Structure formats: C-alpha cells, structure tokens
Scaffold this active site. Structure first.
Site, short mmCIF file in Angstrom:
data_model
loop_
_atom_site.label_atom_id
_atom_site.label_comp_id
_atom_site.label_asym_id
_atom_site.label_seq_id
_atom_site.Cartn_x
_atom_site.Cartn_y
_atom_site.Cartn_z
N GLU A 168 8.29 54.82 -27.39
CA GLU A 168 7.73 53.77 -26.54
C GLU A 168 6.77 54.39 -25.52
OE1 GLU A 168 10.03 49.83 -26.23
OE2 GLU A 168 8.24 50.22 -27.45
N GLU B 30 28.81 58.84 12.50
CA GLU B 30 28.96 57.80 13.52
C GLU B 30 27.95 57.89 14.65
OE1 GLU B 30 33.24 58.34 14.65
OE2 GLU B 30 33.43 56.44 13.55
N1 LIG Z 1 32.33 64.08 30.28
C1 LIG Z 1 33.49 63.51 30.04
N2 LIG Z 1 34.36 63.51 31.13
C2 LIG Z 1 35.62 62.96 31.05
N3 LIG Z 1 36.03 62.36 29.88
C3 LIG Z 1 35.19 62.35 28.78
C4 LIG Z 1 33.90 62.89 28.84
N4 LIG Z 1 33.38 62.69 27.59
C5 LIG Z 1 34.24 62.05 26.82
N5 LIG Z 1 35.37 61.82 27.54
C6 LIG Z 1 36.61 61.12 27.02
O1 LIG Z 1 36.63 61.44 25.62
C7 LIG Z 1 36.69 60.29 24.82
C8 LIG Z 1 35.54 60.29 23.84
O2 LIG Z 1 36.02 60.47 22.52
P1 LIG Z 1 35.35 61.61 21.62
O3 LIG Z 1 33.83 61.65 21.81
O4 LIG Z 1 36.00 62.89 21.95
O5 LIG Z 1 35.70 61.27 20.10
P2 LIG Z 1 36.85 60.40 19.42
O6 LIG Z 1 37.75 59.78 20.45
O7 LIG Z 1 37.54 61.29 18.50
O8 LIG Z 1 36.10 59.38 18.49
P3 LIG Z 1 35.20 58.15 19.00
O9 LIG Z 1 34.66 58.53 20.40
O10 LIG Z 1 34.06 57.86 18.02
O11 LIG Z 1 36.11 56.99 19.16
C9 LIG Z 1 36.65 59.08 25.72
O12 LIG Z 1 37.74 58.22 25.33
C10 LIG Z 1 36.74 59.62 27.17
O13 LIG Z 1 37.85 59.29 27.95
MG LIG Z 2 34.17 59.88 17.24
#
Ligand SMILES: Nc1ncnc2c1ncn2[C@@H]1O[C@H](COP(=O)(O)OP(=O)(O)OP(=O)(O)O)[C@@H](O)[C@H]1O
Ligand SMILES: [Mg+2]
Ligand SMILES: Nc1ncnc2c1ncn2[C@@H]1O[C@H](COP(=O)(O)OP(=O)(O)OP(=O)(O)O)[C@@H](O)[C@H]1O
Ligand SMILES: Nc1ncnc2c1ncn2[C@@H]1O[C@H](COP(=O)(O)OP(=O)(O)OP(=O)(O)O)[C@@H](O)[C@H]1O
Ligand SMILES: Nc1ncnc2c1ncn2[C@@H]1O[C@H](COP(=O)(O)OP(=O)(O)OP(=O)(O)O)[C@@H](O)[C@H]1O
Ligand SMILES: Nc1ncnc2c1ncn2[C@@H]1O[C@H](COP(=O)(O)OP(=O)(O)OP(=O)(O)O)[C@@H](O)[C@H]1O
Ligand SMILES: [Mg+2]
Ligand SMILES: [Mg+2]
Ligand SMILES: [Mg+2]
Ligand SMILES: [Mg+2]
Ligand SMILES: [Mg+2]
Ligand SMILES: [Mg+2]
Ligand SMILES: [Mg+2]
EC number: 2.7.11.1
Lengths: 506, 74, 62, 491
Positions: free
Chosen positions: A64, A305
């Site tokens: 073809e 994510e």
């Molecule tokens: N600079 C920061 N100071 C204090 N706490 C923080 C800070 N950054 C993040 N956090 C805390 O960490 C968490 C963020 O989650 P993280 O980014 O570690 O990933 P995960 O919980 O595993 O997944 P996802 O965030 O997608 O739900 C928040 O719930 C918050 O309380």
């Molecule tokens: Mg996460």
C-alpha cells in the site's frame, strides 16, 4: 538452548525474550494489528537490524505504501534505509497499485509475486523478508475461501525457499478476530498480535505472541512503546527475581531517623514513606535527594504533584538549596503529570533518565499520584516495574505514598504495595489537646533492627526534628489519643522555682 | 461519493487512487468522513483507515445524557 | 527532502500541540467522526488559518 | 443576507430554548426516532404554532396516516386542524398510497411529488413545511445509496423553494443509528433525535439536537413530556442562576422554631427538614402549611407517602383542621405514589399545579419518597427543577427527607441535596435513660443566625413543643448520649 526450533534475533528491545529467542528460522510470522498499532515498523525494524547487526540482506515488499515513503518515514527513528537500498543490503520491492489502475489482479499475480520475491531473494542473497499489508491484496473482491489458499501458497513457497518471513495484518476490533479474513491465524506458523487498547481516553499498546509453533515463549500481552528508537518492550513478567542484596548502609539525610533505622537505610532497599496529606513525606524525600548529592553521588527526583519551581521554593525554605544541586550536576529533577501519558510511558521516561544520568539514588514523590484513574493491578504492576528496575541496579529507592484518609486509615497501602517494599517509613498526625501534631514511626526494615517507638517530629526552617514518644497515650494511631497517666511529672528534670534564664544571659 | 452502490473493496482502491494522485501534486490534504457508532469502525466502510497516511478521530461521546467532544490522533 | 516528515501548522488551538507540529506536508490526513462532531469545521478552519496566517491559498471541495 | 444564521422559533415549550432560536429558517431539520417518540406530533405542533402565532401557512405531508386521521388525532391537544384546512392556512398534502396499486415506481413519484410540493408552497404561500414518515416511502425496495439520492433531491429543492422544513424519520434501536438507513444522518442540516428510553420498566422521553449546521445549540439530552397541550421540554440545564433574593421573613408554624432560626425562614429560600423515620418531619410540614392559612395565603402540599384521608386524621390529631383549610381554598393537597410516574412527569404536575393556585408557600412530603427507585443523578436533577422553580418564583420551599438510618446517621442527606438547600432543620432521635426522645436543630441557614443548640422536643395533641437542650450530655448527635455527671470541680 533447549528448544527444537532454530530462531533468529530481531534485536528489538524486548521481543527476543518474549519470543524466547526470535522468529523461527525458515518460517513465517504473522504480526497482526489494528490501525496504527506498530505493525509495519516492526517489519522494517526486523529487516533493519538484520542488516546493521548480522549483515543479512533483507527484502521488503510494500503493498500500500510508496517505496519512497517507507524510506522517508523510517527516517523518524533515524535510519538511512536509502543508503541501504543503495549498498545492496535492503531491496524494497514495490507492488503498490497505480493511480490510474484498472480492476482485477490478485491471483496470477500472486503466482508472479512468488517468482518476483524469489528473484530478489536469490539476487540480493537475503535471509529476512517482510510482506507488509497482504490484506490490501484481497481487498478487491475476495472471501475467506480464496484467502487461505492464496496466503498459504505464498508462505508455503517462501518456506521452501528458506526465507525467515514476516507478514502484516490489519484488523478492525482490538480483541476480536485476529485478522480480517479470520483465516490468516492458522495459515501462519506464528502469530504476533499488536494492540492499542483504549480505555480511560488514554492509549495502551501491547504485543502478544498467541502461538509459536515449535517452541515456548511468554504468554499474554506485554506493553511496548514506540520511541525515537522504535519498538521498546517490557517483559515485566520476564523480570526474574535475582537482584543483589547488600548490608551496605546509606543516609536518609535525617540523622535521628538513621538511628531509628538500625544505622542508615540499606543501599539495596526500597523505601516507602506513607502518611496522610500534609504529614511531611515530600520533605524527607528532598532531604534524601539532598544528602545523596552532599556525598557526591547522583540521584533523581520525579515529582508528579509539585512543580520544578515550587519543589525548590519549599525545598529552600526547608534549607537545602536545590538550585546548586542542579548546577553541580548531582541531582536531577524530572517533574511531570501522571495524566500526561499512560504508565507504560511513565515507566520508560523514568527508566530513560536513569540511564542518561546513572543515579545512585532515586525518589518518586507520590506513587499514589500515579495511581490516579488507573486500575490497581495496572498500577501495582507498574510499581513492581520501577521497584524492579531499581532493585537489580543497586539504586536506592524512596517512594512516597499518601493515604486517602488522615487519622484513622487502617491501611497505609490503599493499593496494597507494602509487601513488595523492603522498608516503610510512617508519618501520621496526632490530635493532642486541640492541636494537630505530627509523629513518625519506623514500621519495618527487612534487614535492620530499627527503633519501635512512634516518636513525634516537628518541622522548622531547619527541618525534621525527631523528638520524643507519646508513651502516656493510648489509642495513638486512632489519631485522637487518650491521655492515661501513671506519671509525666516523673523526674527528667523536676527542680521547681527558677529553672530558666531568658535571652539576656545564662 | 461511494454511496451510489459500492462495497468495501471498490471503495478502498478508490481512496488509494484519490489519496495518491493528491500525493503527487504535493497537496497537504485533509479528508472528512462520516461514521456510524462513536467507537465502532473508524470509517463508514471499514477500510479508509489503513489507506490513509494520517488518521484523526473527532468523537462526540454520549454518557449520562451529557455529550463530551474529544479528538484523537490514531 | 532527506530528513524526517515536515509538518504544517493548523493554528487550531491545541491540535498543533497534540500533533507535534501539525499535519504532515504533502499528505492527506483523514478526519472522520459521527454526524455533528467536527470534520467540516476542522477542514474549513484548517484552510482558513492557512490563508489568514501564512498566506497559503486554499481549495475546498464539497 | 450576509448575516449569521436566521432561526424561526417553534413556540414548542423548551425547544426554542435548546436550539438557541429555533430550526434555521429555510433549511431542513431532521427529527427522527423509534415508534412512539414524538415525530408526528412534533411536526404537527411545528406547523400549528406557525399558523396560530405568525400567520405562516403550513404544508404537512403524510406518507402513511390518512389526512382524515392527522386531524382526528390532533383533536387530542385541543386543535381542530379541519379549521385551518377550511381557512387554507395548512394543507395536508395526502401522499399515502391506497389499498390497491402497482410497482416499479421508484424515483418515479419522488419527482412528481416535488412538483405537488412546490405546488402548494406557491399556492398556499407556505413558509413551514413538515414531512412525516418520509422513510415509509423508500420502504418499497431500496438500499442506502438509493435513499441518499431520493432524499437529497428533495431537501435540495426545498432549500431552493426557501421554506423551512422538518423530516420525520424512524429508528429501530434507541441508541444505534440516527435514521433507518444511517444516510439521512448526513443528508440533513440539523439532526434532532427523539429517544423514548426504557429502563426499570419505566419510560423517559428525551430529545436532543445532535447538530445544527452554522450555529451553536444545546449539547446533550433533555427530558420532555407529552400531554394534552402538546410536547413540553424542560431545559433543566438552561434555567439560569438569576433567582430573586429578599431579606423578608416567614413563620415556620412553630413559634419557638421561628425564634431558633433568628426571626424565621426567608420567604425566598428552600428549607430541608431531615431525620430518621418517625422523627416528625410530616409534623413540621403540617405546621408550616397552616401558618400560610392564618395569613390567608395559598399554600400547596405534595404527599407521596400518606393518603388524602390519613393525613386529615393525623392532622386533626395535632390540632390543625385541614377540612377548613381546603374549603377556604387557601390550601391544596395532592398525593400520588412515586411509582405512578417518573420524575419527569412529576416535576411537571408540580409546575402546572403551582400555576393554578398561585401559591406563596409549598412543601413536598418526603424527597426520598421520590428518590425511590430512581438513579441519584436522575433524582438530583428532579430536585434542582422544583428547587429552582420554587425559587425564581418567590415561593418559599420546604422539603422532607427521611434519612436511610435512624440514630448516628452521618449526613442530613444521602442523595446529597445538602448543598442545594439553604436552611437545614435536622430532627434526630436521642436515647436517654431507656427512652426514644427527640431533638430538633437548625443545622444551617445561609442568612439568619439560627440557634446552635440541639433542643429536644415532644409531640402532643397540641403539636410540637420544643424544650431545653441536653447541656449535660455528650455525643448527642451520635444518638446514644453519655451524661457527664462531672463531679463538679470536686470542691
Ligand atoms: N518552612 C516550613 N516551616 C514549618 N513547617 C513547614 C515548612 N514547610 C513545610 N512545613 C510543614 O510541612 C508540611 C508540608 O508537607 P510536605 O511538603 O513535607 O509533604 P507531604 O506532607 O508529604 O505531602 P503533601 O504536602 O503533598 O501533602 C506542612 O503540613 C507543614 O506543616
Ligand atoms: Mg507531597
Ligand atoms: N519517532 C516516532 N516516535 C514516536 N512514535 C512514532 C515515531 N514514528 C512513528 N511513530 C508511531 O508509529 C506508528 C506508525 O505505525 P507503523 O508505520 O509502524 O505501521 P502500522 O501502524 O502497523 O500500520 P499502518 O500503515 O496501517 O498504519 C504511529 O502510531 C505513530 O504514532
Ligand atoms: N458557531 C458555532 N458555535 C458553537 N458550536 C457550533 C457553531 N457552529 C456549529 N457548531 C456545532 O458544530 C456542529 C456542526 O458540525 P460541522 O458543520 O462542524 O461538521 P461535522 O459535525 O463534522 O459534519 P456534518 O456535516 O455531519 O455535521 C453542530 O452540531 C454544533 O454543535
Ligand atoms: N392527549 C395525549 N396526552 C398524553 N399523551 C398523548 C396524547 N396523545 C398522544 N400521546 C402520546 O404521544 C405519542 C404520539 O406520537 P406521534 O403519533 O405524535 O408520533 P411518533 O410516535 O413520533 O411517530 P408514529 O407516527 O410512528 O407514532 C403516543 O405514543 C402517546 O403516548
Ligand atoms: N397524637 C399524637 N400524640 C403523640 N404523638 C404523636 C401523635 N401523632 C403523631 N405522633 C408522633 O409523631 C410520629 C409520627 O410521625 P410524623 O407524622 O411526624 O412523620 P415522620 O416521622 O416525619 O415520617 P414517617 O411518618 O413516614 O415516619 C409518631 O412516631 C409519634 O411519636
Ligand atoms: Mg494504519
Ligand atoms: Mg504500516
Ligand atoms: Mg460535514
Ligand atoms: Mg407518523
Ligand atoms: Mg456529513
Ligand atoms: Mg418516616
Ligand atoms: Mg414521613
């Protein structure tokens, strides 16, 4: 090798295993399939390699498609077939009808074609032959009766000649009859079905070897991908279980945790970090990748994510500078959407980047991110994949699983992957006094001994602070614990009155 | 054009001609076709597919009384 | 030429994205669908965005 | 005519809303579907509205029912077609074969007929033409390819003529081909599809505009009714979210309850009373409906669980006499098992009746009674219709919902109407000292402030008597309380 049928290799990433060796020499394999499934490439790819790997001239009959195009198209995978049709290694044999043709010509020509192909094969001294789209020949005014006899003649003669041939067949339905005239399936010695199943508006292609008269092979479907390099298969089931295991230990990037794991994660070990949304998983992973680069080793991070940008914002806020990591050429962040392809692809994108960078560590933030839409088995099988690859490659893996129900999740799997995994890390909230506090725990470690406490941890600009255990609390896991005290005021540092100093001086 | 009294074969050979001549000219052509069932064959006469260099499908999938328009590149 | 397949742009928002450039050159692209799905408009609009964006005459057969 | 497509409204309730104007003037529309979908009616109603509204002579062409019949039947929706035939405003061009005949008359008549057509078009100065059962013509001995030409010749000619058309077509599978030969499909400028879907041994009529060349329209299916006043299509999607909103207040029938909701219910608003079987929803409705009879106002009651009789009883038992409420034509009760019909027919009955009583209040005795035997989606749609209608009409609405499980029920609603209702009155049994006591609560009110306590109440012959909360208990909502009997502060 224990088989009684001599086989020749296709050199097609995957096939030669599924076919336990490659097409049976001196025989005809029918690779059939829906429109756009992969067929004609397979064919071309089959003749190609024979040329560029065994120096076996091949004869490609087009029916073809225009002999010009076959070369024009095959350039996509980066092949100068031209040059081969030129050096006398590949003879394209046109048989395409004409733009000003009559009507009626598919029986005596079928006798002429035999002699035809028989000429070029004798001429060019060929071993491999492709007959792309025989179907189109019968699509003039034919029915089942005349197709089995006519095909047969062709393959019958072909086998006599001694050429290892491949014919291609189209088919309307993906699972139904193998070929159009529902007759090619029994006239061939082997039958290679190629499908491209839909489902969930996405597209999944698979290869299956229904039969191989004379020998064994891998049964059922196997996913493949057509990349800039052509066909690429995954014998996810031919993936034997004989990876290497070692008592070597690496860091988690979190010190206190390390202890908690008997002395640092095992080099060869899969790691799972499950915890409700917002528990921390993403962090740890970042602290895992970080450290890997702080010791001068490569590592990848596939974020499904959060963006590459944001992965850095929150990464920097937690300390650890990813900007540099990227620059020192030690950490590579992929980052993509699970909806931007089917798993087969995602599994390969990952594999690729694992070969164009050679990590010594890898982290997949939110496997459960990939479990979106997809069926459990489909996803479970993909998990076995990555998990599989990294295991036999001494590449430490840290996967992230986010449970769909914070506080009260009676299962940190949801998809039941906790048994393929070697070491799990658990993060979960704890309702203590109108406050959402966190707490990590080391569930299992196959080789280590690890701490059995469900310690509490806190997040600061500095990072994961692993404090102390909720000894005086029952129903912990329940999320909202019950305070039962036998003590608490117990020593540790009683001494009342003035115990502190303040900011001026101590 | 084939809706005069034609069958699969007759119709395939014809598409070939049409497409081919158009190939010679060097004309980047687009060809519209009708269907019968949103997921059934790709073209009224079960052949048009394999005969074309490129194929596209515009689907107006039904579902819960709400139609959803999609486009795919087979 | 002696390289890959060159494509043309349809300037149809999205499709030139999904198709990695757009329709191949000097080649027919089949576009079929049930009554009321797109086709014509996809053909008309491919022609149109042709004139109106690179100045490439169009021929519509109906 | 260098302007966008021109449409001619059909005055068929709901269609002109779905087609965004109405079948494109001078072109051909294709309403096809299986036996008993609307077709014949449609076109008939198509022409009618065309005459008795814009003096637009109609040309009806039959290929099977005798002209005599089209009239006979038509009288079904109160319209003597004979009158317009006498008035030369509509011509039923008989084209149905007689008992006897011959054959081999293929495209033979399809031609002569186009003349007889053009004939009356000119003669009667036509504008709207309808052709019922065109297919019953090729059903002589033809094949696809043959029909495509006999059809296109027509439409083509018709577009020339310039009259706006509609062609009736039949279908065999409700969701398979669009028309018997799957040709007419593409031979039309516009394809409408009447679907008389089964399911659960119940039937729902659904119309849809698959395509309208050169103009936008309404994508998807729509339920439609067939009554005494022709076809009716409720564009439950079309209805806009531009409801009138006032801050005025209305009584709930129960003083102490009017207090709880911070002044009362808002005239313009929907309220939902939820609870396990027995809780007393039917009470609140009985009480909510008398109040509108004290301020001498018309209010309606839709019961789907109890009878005309039984209600009267249990009502005189709570004190409120309905016997007078009716006499004073200030209260109308309906009653009809949910099974007697499907949500489509219901929604309508409601609407229609509301137009013949100009209510100012209304209460449907149990929604779950109606969510009986129907898919959530199908029901969920039925709410929004009444809910929506009662709204942009100023009518305060109160709907009943028996939650599928007493005590501990974890949702005021199952079907999920929570987010469709403004105020949520929540009834719930409470277990104390071995006795099934009640508890009323104003769960949510979008405007007011309402009481935040869970107050128990009781039922006597004087009606509901809200009382005091369970200040001293715990887990109240769960259902099975747990007194705290806290030992003070222990001195
Ligand atoms: N600079 C920061 N100071 C204090 N706490 C923080 C800070 N950054 C993040 N956090 C805390 O960490 C968490 C963020 O989650 P993280 O980014 O570690 O990933 P995960 O919980 O595993 O997944 P996802 O965030 O997608 O739900 C928040 O719930 C918050 O309380
Ligand atoms: Mg996460
Ligand atoms: N470089 C490439 N990268 C990714 N995909 C490619 C590339 N080149 C071709 N493809 C894909 O390969 C397929 C082409 O199919 P192929 O030419 O192998 O024969 P076929 O599908 O078996 O038969 P037919 O001629 O009827 O389409 C398409 O589905 C196309 O998307
Ligand atoms: N201006 C417009 N705005 C929005 N939608 C439109 C507009 N015009 C047409 N449409 C939609 O597009 C459809 C018209 O189809 P179109 O003319 O593009 O060709 P097709 O569906 O491919 O083939 P066919 O001739 O069988 O209809 C209508 O069914 C309608 O839903
Ligand atoms: N007065 C009426 N009240 C309620 N429903 C009615 C009334 N008259 C007719 N109907 C209903 O409407 C339908 C009439 O359909 P109609 O004769 O208009 O055309 P059709 O069903 O589209 O095609 P066909 O000629 O094959 O029946 C009946 O099937 C019936 O259920
Ligand atoms: N005369 C009365 N005296 C005391 N209590 C009564 C009297 N009439 C009814 N009740 C009480 O009210 C309840 C009757 O239920 P009601 O009419 O309030 O509707 P419901 O609970 O919302 O729905 P359903 O009747 O379908 O269960 C009885 O279970 C009972 O406790
Ligand atoms: Mg193909
Ligand atoms: Mg091919
Ligand atoms: Mg069209
Ligand atoms: Mg009829
Ligand atoms: Mg069309
Ligand atoms: Mg009840
Ligand atoms: Mg009740």
């Amino acid at each position: 090798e224990h088989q009684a049928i001599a086989k020749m290799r296709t050199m097609i990433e995957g096939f030669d295993d599924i076919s336990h060796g490659g097409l049976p020499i001196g025989r005809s394999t029918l690779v059939s399939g829906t429109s756009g499934t992969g067929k004609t490439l397979f064919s071309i790819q089959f003749l190609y390699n024979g040329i560029i790997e065994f120096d076996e001239p091949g004869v490609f009959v087009t029916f073809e498609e225009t002999p010009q195009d076959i070369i024009k198209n095959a350039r996509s995978f980066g092949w100068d077939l031209a040059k081969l049709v030129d050096e006398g290694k590949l003879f394209i044999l046109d048989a395409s009808p004409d733009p000003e043709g009559q009507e009626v010509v598919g029986g005596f020509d079928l006798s002429a074609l035999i002699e035809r192909i028989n000429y070029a094969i004798q001429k060019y001294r060929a071993r491999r032959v492709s007959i792309d789209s025989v179907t189109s020949v019968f699509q003039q005014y034919d029915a089942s009766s005349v197709v089995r006899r006519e095909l047969f003649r062709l393959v019958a003669r072909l086998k006599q000649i001694g050429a290892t041939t491949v014919m291609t067949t189209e088919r309307i339905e993906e699972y139904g009859p193998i070929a159009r005239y529902g007759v090619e399936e029994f006239v061939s010695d082997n039958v290679v079905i190629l499908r491209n199943v839909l489902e969930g508006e996405r597209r999944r292609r698979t290869l299956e070897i229904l039969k191989l008269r004379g020998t064994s092979h891998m049964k059922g479907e196997y996913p493949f991908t057509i990349t800039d390099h052509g066909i690429n298969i995954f014998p996810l089931g031919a993936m034997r279980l004989t990876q290497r295991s070692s008592n070597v230990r690496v860091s988690s990037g979190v010190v206190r945790l390390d202890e908690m794991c008997g002395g640092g994660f095992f080099k060869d070990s899969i790691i799972l970090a499950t915890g409700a949304t917002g528990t921390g998983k993403t962090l740890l992973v970042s602290r895992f990748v970080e450290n890997a680069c702080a010791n001068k080793e490569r590592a990848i991070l596939f974020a499904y994510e959060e963006s590459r940008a944001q992965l850095l914002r929150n990464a920097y806020s937690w300390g650890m500078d990813f900007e540099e990591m990227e620059r020192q050429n030690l950490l590579k962040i992929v980052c993509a959407y699970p909806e931007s392809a089917g798993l087969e692809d995602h599994l390969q994108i990952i594999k690729s980047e694992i070969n164009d960078f050679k990590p010594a560590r890898i982290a997949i933030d939110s496997l459960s991110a990939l479990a979106r839409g997809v069926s459990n088995n489909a996803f479970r099988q993909f998990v076995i994949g990555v998990t599989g690859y990294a295991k036999q490659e001494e590449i430490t893996g840290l996967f992230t699983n986010t449970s769909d129900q914070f506080m009260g999740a009676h299962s940190i799997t949801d998809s039941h992957i906790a048994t393929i995994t070697d070491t799990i890390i658990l993060l979960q909230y704890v309702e203590i006094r109108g406050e959402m506090s966190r707490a990590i725990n080391v569930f299992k470690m196959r080789g280590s001994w690890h701490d059995k406490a469900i310690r509490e941890f806190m997040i600061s600009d500095k990072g994961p602070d692993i404090k102390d255990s909720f000894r005086n609390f029952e129903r912990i896991i329940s999320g909202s614990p019950t305070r039962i005290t036998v003590d608490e005021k117990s020593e540790l540092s009683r001494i009342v009155r003035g115990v502190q100093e303040k900011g001026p001086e101590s």
